[PDB]
Design a protein around this nucleic acid. Structure first.
Ligand code: SR
Ligand code: SR
Ligand code: SR
Ligand code: SR
Ligand code: SR
Ligand code: SR
Ligand code: SR
Ligand code: SR
Ligand code: SR
Ligand code: SR
Ligand code: SR
Ligand code: SR
Ligand code: SR
Ligand code: SR
Ligand code: SR
Ligand code: SR
Ligand code: SR
Ligand code: SR
Ligand code: SR
Ligand code: SR
Ligand code: SR
Ligand code: SR
Ligand code: SR
Ligand code: SR
Ligand code: SR
Ligand code: SR
Ligand code: SR
Ligand code: SR
Ligand code: SR
Ligand code: SR
Ligand code: SR
Ligand code: SR
Ligand code: SR
Ligand code: SR
Ligand code: SR
Ligand code: SR
Length: 81
RNA sequence: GAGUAGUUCAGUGGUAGAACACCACCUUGCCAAGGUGGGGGUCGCGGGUUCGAAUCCCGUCUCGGGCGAAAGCCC
RNA sequence: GGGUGCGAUGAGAAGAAGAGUAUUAAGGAUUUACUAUGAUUAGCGACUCUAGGAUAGUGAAAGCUAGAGGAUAGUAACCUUAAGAAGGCACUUCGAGCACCC
């Protein structure tokens, strides 16, 4: 969802970033873009799978990272509550 | 008057020079830079002159320019 | 504040390599190449010798081409010592602006 990423306090941007923060385990939820290359998106849902955290799925990796504040759009972004 | 190496330029009768680019090694993470080495040229083309022609001479092609009624002519 | 180019497919910083390398110096060492020079006097023009070429004049010997052989330095290649770097991609954390222009 985009209201929830717009939302909140502590969020996480870029995919190397979600992945690194995934092995920390202090993320509450993680949201990802379907238009993205599945080469990377693979690598965020495998372990957001294994861990147990809810994964949701996005249309465009572009309005995602307008939601984030960035003026560029992101392929993976995590709300680390 | 312009014409010479990929390009930009020199070269004012003694076999064609520089930069830059291209090749090779340095140099296996991949480049760039660098430092060495090497390659490459009917001097637009054909004559003539000369021991020798990028050089001077005549013809010829292209291109700029100018004189001209043109044909032509000059740089 | 304006105009562009790029950025979570990673802006930008730092670390880490790079590397005790390239290299500048002080030596050591005396072979390989690279280049530079070859008394005077003729001569525009000469390290020596060989073969071809080709030769008008000057010359003891001439400009091309292909080889081979000589000393003087200057060089880069091997050693020692003291000094000795660096830009980008890629690595490694932090993670959003950086670059050109008025
Ligand atoms: Sr921006
Ligand atoms: Sr030309
Ligand atoms: Sr000229
Ligand atoms: Sr190479
Ligand atoms: Sr180079
Ligand atoms: Sr060279
Ligand atoms: Sr050369
Ligand atoms: Sr050369
Ligand atoms: Sr050719
Ligand atoms: Sr001829
Ligand atoms: Sr002749
Ligand atoms: Sr001729
Ligand atoms: Sr004319
Ligand atoms: Sr007229
Ligand atoms: Sr992109
Ligand atoms: Sr960077
Ligand atoms: Sr750095
Ligand atoms: Sr360093
Ligand atoms: Sr490194
Ligand atoms: Sr290395
Ligand atoms: Sr070290
Ligand atoms: Sr004298
Ligand atoms: Sr003399
Ligand atoms: Sr002399
Ligand atoms: Sr000789
Ligand atoms: Sr011989
Ligand atoms: Sr002979
Ligand atoms: Sr004679
Ligand atoms: Sr003679
Ligand atoms: Sr020779
Ligand atoms: Sr010497
Ligand atoms: Sr050394
Ligand atoms: Sr790589
Ligand atoms: Sr800078
Ligand atoms: Sr102004
Ligand atoms: Sr102004």
């Amino acid at each position: 969802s985009y209201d929830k990423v717009s939302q909140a306090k502590s969020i996480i941007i870029g995919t190397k970033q979600t992945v690194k923060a995934l092995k920390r385990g202090s993320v509450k939820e993680v949201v990802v873009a379907k238009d993205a290359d599945p080469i990377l998106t693979s690598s965020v849902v495998s372990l957001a799978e294994d861990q147990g955290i809810s994964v949701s799925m996005v249309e465009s990796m572009k309005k995602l990272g307008k939601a984030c504040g960035i003026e560029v759009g992101a392929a993976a972004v995590a709300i680390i509550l």
